[PDB]
Amino acid sequence: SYDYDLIIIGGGSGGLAAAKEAAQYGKKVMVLDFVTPTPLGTRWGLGGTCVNVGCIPKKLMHQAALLGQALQDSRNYGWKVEETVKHDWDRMIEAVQNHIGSLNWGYRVALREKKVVYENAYGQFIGPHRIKATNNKGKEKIYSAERFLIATGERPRYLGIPGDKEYCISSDDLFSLPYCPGKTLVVGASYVALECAGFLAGIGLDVTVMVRSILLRGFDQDMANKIGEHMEEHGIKFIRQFVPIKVEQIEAGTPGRLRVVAQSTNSEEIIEGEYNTVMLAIGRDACTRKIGLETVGVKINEKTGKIPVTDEEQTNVPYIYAIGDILEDKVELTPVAIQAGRLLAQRLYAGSTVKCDYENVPTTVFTPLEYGACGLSEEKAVEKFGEENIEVYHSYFWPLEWTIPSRDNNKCYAKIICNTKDNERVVGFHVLGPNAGEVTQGFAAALKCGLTKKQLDSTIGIHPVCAEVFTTLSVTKRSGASILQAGCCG
Amino acid sequence: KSYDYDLIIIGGGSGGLAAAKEAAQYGKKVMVLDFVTPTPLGTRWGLGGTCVNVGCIPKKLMHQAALLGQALQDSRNYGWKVEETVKHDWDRMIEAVQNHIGSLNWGYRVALREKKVVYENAYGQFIGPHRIKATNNKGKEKIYSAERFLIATGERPRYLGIPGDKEYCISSDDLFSLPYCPGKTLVVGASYVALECAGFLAGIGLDVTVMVRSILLRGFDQDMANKIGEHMEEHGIKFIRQFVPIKVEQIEAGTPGRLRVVAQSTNSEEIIEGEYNTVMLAIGRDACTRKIGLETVGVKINEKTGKIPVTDEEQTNVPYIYAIGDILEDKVELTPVAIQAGRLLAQRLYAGSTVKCDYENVPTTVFTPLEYGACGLSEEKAVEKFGEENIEVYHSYFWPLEWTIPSRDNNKCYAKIICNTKDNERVVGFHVLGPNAGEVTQGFAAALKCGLTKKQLDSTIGIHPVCAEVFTTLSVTKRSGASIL
Numbered sequence: 001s002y003d004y005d006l007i008i009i010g011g012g013s014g015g016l017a018a019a020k021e022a023a024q025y026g027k028k029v030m031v032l033d034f035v036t037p038t039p040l041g042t043r044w045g046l047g048g049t050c051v052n053v054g055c056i057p058k059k060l061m062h063q064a065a066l067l068g069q070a071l072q073d074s075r076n077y078g079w080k081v082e083e084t085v086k087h088d089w090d091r092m093i094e095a096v097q098n099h100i101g102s103l104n105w106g107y108r109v110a111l112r113e114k115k116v117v118y119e120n121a122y123g124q125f126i127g128p129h130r131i132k133a134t135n136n137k138g139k140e141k142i143y144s145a146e147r148f149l150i151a152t153g154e155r156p157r158y159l160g161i162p163g164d165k166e167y168c169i170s171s172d173d174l175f176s177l178p179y180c181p182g183k184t185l186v187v188g189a190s191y192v193a194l195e196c197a198g199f200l201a202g203i204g205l206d207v208t209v210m211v212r213s214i215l216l217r218g219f220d221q222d223m224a225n226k227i228g229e230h231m232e233e234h235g236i237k238f239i240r241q242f243v244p245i246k247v248e249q250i251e252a253g254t255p256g257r258l259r260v261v262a263q264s265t266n267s268e269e270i271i272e273g274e275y276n277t278v279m280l281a282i283g284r285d286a287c288t289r290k291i292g293l294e295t296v297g298v299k300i301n302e303k304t305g306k307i308p309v310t311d312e313e314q315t316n317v318p319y320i321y322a323i324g325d326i327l328e329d330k331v332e333l334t335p336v337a338i339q340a341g342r343l344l345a346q347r348l349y350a351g352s353t354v355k356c357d358y359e360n361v362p363t364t365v366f367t368p369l370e371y372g373a374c375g376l377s378e379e380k381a382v383e384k385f386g387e388e389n390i391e392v393y394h395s396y397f398w399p400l401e402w403t404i405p406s407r408d409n410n411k412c413y414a415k416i417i418c419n420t421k422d423n424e425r426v427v428g429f430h431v432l433g434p435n436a437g438e439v440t441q442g443f444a445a446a447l448k449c450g451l452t453k454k455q456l457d458s459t460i461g462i463h464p465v466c467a468e469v470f471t472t473l474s475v476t477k478r479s480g481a482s483i484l485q486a487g488c489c490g
Numbered sequence: 491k492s493y494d495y496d497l498i499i500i501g502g503g504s505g506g507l508a509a510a511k512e513a514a515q516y517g518k519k520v521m522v523l524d525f526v527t528p529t530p531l532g533t534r535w536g537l538g539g540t541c542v543n544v545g546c547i548p549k550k551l552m553h554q555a556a557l558l559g560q561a562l563q564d565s566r567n568y569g570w571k572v573e574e575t576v577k578h579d580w581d582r583m584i585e586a587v588q589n590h591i592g593s594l595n596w597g598y599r600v601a602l603r604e605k606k607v608v609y610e611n612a613y614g615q616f617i618g619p620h621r622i623k624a625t626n627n628k629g630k631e632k633i634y635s636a637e638r639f640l641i642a643t644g645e646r647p648r649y650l651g652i653p654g655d656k657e658y659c660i661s662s663d664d665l666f667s668l669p670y671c672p673g674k675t676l677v678v679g680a681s682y683v684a685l686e687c688a689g690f691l692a693g694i695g696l697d698v699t700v701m702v703r704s705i706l707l708r709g710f711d712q713d714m715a716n717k718i719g720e721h722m723e724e725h726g727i728k729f730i731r732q733f734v735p736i737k738v739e740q741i742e743a744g745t746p747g748r749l750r751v752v753a754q755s756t757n758s759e760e761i762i763e764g765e766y767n768t769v770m771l772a773i774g775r776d777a778c779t780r781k782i783g784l785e786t787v788g789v790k791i792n793e794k795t796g797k798i799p800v801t802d803e804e805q806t807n808v809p810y811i812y813a814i815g816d817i818l819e820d821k822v823e824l825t826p827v828a829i830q831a832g833r834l835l836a837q838r839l840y841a842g843s844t845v846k847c848d849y850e851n852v853p854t855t856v857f858t859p860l861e862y863g864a865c866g867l868s869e870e871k872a873v874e875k876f877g878e879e880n881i882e883v884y885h886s887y888f889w890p891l892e893w894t895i896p897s898r899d900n901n902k903c904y905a906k907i908i909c910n911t912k913d914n915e916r917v918v919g920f921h922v923l924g925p926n927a928g929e930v931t932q933g934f935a936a937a938l939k940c941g942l943t944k945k946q947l948d949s950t951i952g953i954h955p956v957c958a959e960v961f962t963t964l965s966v967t968k969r970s971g972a973s974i975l
């Protein structure tokens with residue numbers, strides 16, 4: 001009957017996921033993926049945001065920044081290393097890209113092998129069960145399928161001020177930028193902002209951060225402030241309550257010099273500075289407005305852009321589904337989108353009845369001092385249950401590996417939120433410290449089995465591991481006791 | 491009725507000091523005895539216990555130096571302009587290590603002081619009911635009495651019983667303070683301690699060799715163990731299987747000297763010889779329960795092994811004497827567990843608590859060049875408890891994103907979980923071999939305290955890009971028999 005059994009628009013995380021999973025159950029599948037260039041004209045291969053301008057690139061650069069310190073710790077452990085080592089940006093970028101490349105080509109083969117058709121083209125709906133695929137050279141083509149998957153994902157959002165698109169770079173441009181961005185400026189307080197401000201500073205670049213309001217909106221604010229405080233204390237510069245209003249090229253080059261003017265958010269004050277680069281990280285917009293959603297009947301939320309869907313990842317149009325960052329009121333993370341896409345393909349062609357659960361999803365913001373969390377924030381939690389039925393156990397901690405180099409003591413920190421009405425159930429987990437991601441995974445798994453404080457205490461901790469601090473948490477926030485060492489060094 | 495103290499603790503160690511403090515917190519008169527008998531080579535250390543002085547701490551820390559070496563090589567491909575090979579100054583490391591333990595020593599001291607607990611740097615020995623004889627360092631003695639006692643003496647490195655050992659060989663106790671690059675080293679044994687040390691020693695450059703009687707990590711998942719060895723073998727360390735030394739002769743003394751080690755195979759009667767700069771023994775530890783006067787008071791210990799039997803309340807056969815820690819019979823020989831037992835006892839005793847310390851499913855990690863943490867049943871011991879037909883094994887390989895750029899050891903790391911099919915595919919065993927293994931495990935161990943199941947695990951979303959996430963999507967089983975390369 002139709003051309004294909006399933007067509008996937010967007011070769012992204014949840015894209016390629018459902019693709020392979022659907023292909024696995026002998027269906028005819030076609031994935032179309034096309035990457036519209038960035039204002040400065042940046043392009044990249046198959047894979048998605050995570051692979052080319054997200055997780056992968058982000059985390060790796062974070063690595064180079066962490067290795068930086070490791071070089072500086074290595075000294076006290078006895079390694080004869082120079083007081084200050086230098087860093088070659090062009091060598092780094094290159095390496096990073098070389099890997100993304102392999103990831104690209106890998107995914108390609110991955111589709112080939114699973115007998116899935118990949119078309120490097122932009123897709124838009126023209127009418128029921130029909131889609132318009134436009135390639136790079138311009139030549140179009142039409143296809144039809146019994147069902148459709150929207151996995152287009154979003155893109156970096158700009159300010160709408162003089163000079164941005166023209167002189168500023170975004171997360172897309174960065175991971176491939178070909179020059180020491182030199183003194184940089186990061187406009188925004190997002191995880192992306194912070195992690196990037198984060199590794200750049202960690203490579204030695206002079207870094208400044210411009211914040212409209214709060215840090216990490218949506219995250220435990222207490223944890224956030226701490227991240228900031230750590231950020232400030234280790235080099236990063238912060239300007240609070242200031243949005244830029246114009247970016248002016250004082251000279252072009254690799255890099256150039258630029259003047260950024262900004263207007264405070266609470267007064268008439270205006271300030272000016274010149275930096276070598278300016279990256280904007282103030283949000284990202286769903287790529288749902290230019291695909292033909294009218295010509296097929298999809299109701300999205302024209303206001304925000306996200307797509308409302310059902311617990312089966314189904315739109316309002318029974319043969320058109322959407323999974324990923326584009327969904328309305330969900331979780332914008334790769335492993336999530338992949339579970340959705342995988343689970344869908346199963347729900348659909350395998351008789352599965354399992355729905356991708358979006359409750360209590362773990363995360364990790366890769367700031368200089370990582371911070372992973374799972375479950376409710378302190379605030380959100382209190383709000384849901386009421387300050388009297390919620391207790392918070394917290395503590396600081398110092399990583400054994402940090403004693404010898406003798407740095408940052410009483411800087412790492414942990415806390416869990418419990419619901420006294422429900423057997424002191426662990427509703428929220430929060431840790432700030434190294435390798436926080438590794439530390440969090442499993443506790444998330446614990447939440448899926450209803451961990452409780454009694455049960456947590458019953459656990460014995462590993463020693464000496466950062467993660468063990470959760471097994472022995474005796475101090476409550478409400479009791480009001482203090483949390484510090486009777487030595488205070490670091 | 492009426493005694494000197496309310497509670498006496500023999501042994502100022504992990505569980506010792508733990509119980510000391512928790513009890514003092516409930517207004518009891520406590521006294522802690524801790525004394526360190528020298529090693530044959532004559533080394534001694536401060537308050538604290540094995541962990542702090544010749545164990546966890548020094549061990550991990552040196553592991554760190556070993557790991558930082560790697561970091562120094564990785565840093566290259568990430569953009570840091572460093573030399574092709576950097577040099578490591580042992581003396582300087584040892585020093586750093588020692589300087590931290592001190593603070594730990596003195597910290598505990600103060601810790602007790604402020605908590606109003608009495609501490610005497612003396613050897614304790616029971617002389618009769620509710621009475622103990624504390625001999626100090628210069629030999630002066632003194633007698634104390636208490637309504638209850640706590641044994642927390644823990645073990646010590648065991649020796650072979652062959653010519654040359656106590657006289658030319660070192661143990662874990664001697665190592666972490668050795669005042670000289672051990673040079674070509676030989677580590678006799680295949681215990682975590684053995685491999686761990688052999689591991690970092692090899693990691694800072696030293697020519698390392700390991701001699702094994704039989705298998706590696708007896709007691710551990712043998713599959714996991716092999717992978718640890720095969721990995722150690724792959725990154726420097728040299729092994730010699732089925733051979734125990736029979737004599738160690740001094741070819742010359744020095745800092746360090748040269749020594750000959752003569753060994754006899756176990757499968758034949760062949761005999762080999764080699765000379766190394768030092769020779770460390772990691773063949774076992776023997777509880778210190780033989781010389782404290784346990785006869786004089788009524789304590790029955792298992793004279794065979796050394797451990798002490800006790801109830802599910804860490805109570806001995808004598809109602810007023812309790813024991814916690816490495817010296818217990820059939821339990822768990824790790825620091826956190828001892829600390830829990832001590833803490834929980836004090837509470838069960840003097841605070842009306844009724845909580846028992848659970849020893850089932852205790853997480854642990856071995857800090858070999860390639861960390862390995864595990865929780866619960868091994869595969870073998872697992873099968874053996876439920877039967878090959880009721881146990882399914884999911885496992886995967888994985889490659890840490892941080893390893894990609896430096897381009898190394900791909901398909902070395904490895905995960906694995908054991909489920910009991912007859913019980914909602916419950917997770918009965920967790921095993922991971924990869925970096926930051928401990929961090930990764932901790933939480934899963936807490937998952938087990940809540941009966942995590944494979945359905946539930948699958949319903950968990952992973953963190954990206956984190957090593958840990960590998961356990962959120964395990965599709966392959968060992969029984970199905972597909973591949974993972």
Ligand SMILES: Cc1cc2nc3c(=O)[nH]c(=O)nc-3n(C[C@H](O)[C@H](O)[C@H](O)COP(=O)(O)OP(=O)(O)OC[C@H]3O[C@@H](n4cnc5c(N)ncnc54)[C@H](O)[C@@H]3O)c2cc1C
Nearest residue numbers: 010012013014033034048049050054055123152153324325
């Ligand atoms: C800087 C940064 C760092 C991040 N770090 C992390 C992290 O560490 N961990 C984490 O879990 N998540 C991270 N994320 C989020 C993660 O990248 C996304 O959640 C994930 O990539 C979304 O998967 P997706 O398929 O829904 O969207 P995508 O991965 O972006 O897939 C979308 C693809 O579809 C293509 N496409 C769009 N429209 C069309 C069309 N009309 N026709 C054809 N093709 C089209 C696009 O070109 C794109 O390549 C990060 C994001 C950013 C920006």
Ligand SMILES: Cc1cc2nc3c(=O)[nH]c(=O)nc-3n(C[C@H](O)[C@H](O)[C@H](O)COP(=O)(O)OP(=O)(O)OC[C@H]3O[C@@H](n4cnc5c(N)ncnc54)[C@H](O)[C@@H]3O)c2cc1C
Nearest residue numbers: 501503504505524525539540614643644815816823824825
């Ligand atoms: C190399 C090594 C590495 C280890 N690594 C780890 C690890 O990473 N994680 C982990 O959890 N565990 C580890 N352990 C085990 C851990 O050290 C023990 O489980 C823990 O120290 C036991 O606590 P304890 O109080 O029962 O024994 P101890 O800590 O040894 O306390 C015993 C103290 O009592 C003193 N004492 C003995 N007899 C007398 C006496 N008659 N009078 C007065 N004082 C006395 C001793 O001198 C000693 O200082 C390691 C052990 C070694 C050897």
